[PDB]
């Protein structure tokens, strides 16, 4: 039995559940269906105190905890992946993992929609041709046919150019750093000559 392959690999025991919950939701094309099923349970814990008591209190019996979730996830809002996840997480008392199994589910989802969220921060505000130019420059830094979602910010400590913040990497094409590396190379080279 081999599943769809996950977009990105993640760490264990809370992101290992999300890696499998994503795989049995991409088998029925329910990736966007079980995602807001997850988001509604994030909200249900903000509302209800007897629902979050089934994830923090260690003195609720495991017979009770697996029969409240099974006796409210019926006849509406099931999706049969959400309905079987939260009755599996209530068996082992792992309902407190619902917050971080959601977070790592999005990190598989956002790498499945192929968007890399970006931040381009330049010296002066951009006009129309600079935007099309550095967008073409910045799409040579995404490691797929990824759809860059450039963010624009202003920092005049840069004297022209741009610096791209991918939140995982940073490529600093600015001219202030070009001046700094120029001067470091010059002071490096005149002491070897």
């Amino acid at each position: 039995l081999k599943l769809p392959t996950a977009p990105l690999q993640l760490s264990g025991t809370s992101a290992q559940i999300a890696t499998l919950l994503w795989q049995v939701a991409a088998k029925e094309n329910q990736l966007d269906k079980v995602q807001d099923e997850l988001y509604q349970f994030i909200e249900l814990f903000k509302q209800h105190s007897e629902l979050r008591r089934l994830a923090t209190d260690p003195f609720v019996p495991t017979l009770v905890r697996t029969k409240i979730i099974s006796s409210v996830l019926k006849d509406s809002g099931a999706s049969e992946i959400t309905k079987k996840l939260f009755e599996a997480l209530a068996d082992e008392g792992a309902l407190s993992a619902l917050l971080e199994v959601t977070v790592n589910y999005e990190e598989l989802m956002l790498a499945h929609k192929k968007e890399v969220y970006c931040t381009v921060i330049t010296a002066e505000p951009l006009d129309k041709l600079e935007r099309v130019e550095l967008t073409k420059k910045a799409e040579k830094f995404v490691d797929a046919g990824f759809k860059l979602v450039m963010q624009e910010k202003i920092d005049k400590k840069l004297l022209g150019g741009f610096v791209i913040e991918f939140s995982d990497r940073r490529v600093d094409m600015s001219t202030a750093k070009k001046v700094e590396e120029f001067n470091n190379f010059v002071n490096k080279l005149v002491l070897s000559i």
Binding site: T13, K46, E80, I81, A88, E92
Partner: peptide, 29 residues
């Protein structure tokens, strides 16, 4: 915040994924 009590999870089982896996994958059609 009223969701801080679920910030980090605690598990009674190192093989939690081995129980979730036998209940998630038979639930597909």
């Amino acid at each position: 915040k009223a969701l801080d009590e679920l910030r980090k999870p605690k598990f009674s089982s190192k093989y939690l994924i081995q129980h979730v896996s036998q209940k998630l994958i038979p639930a597909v059609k």
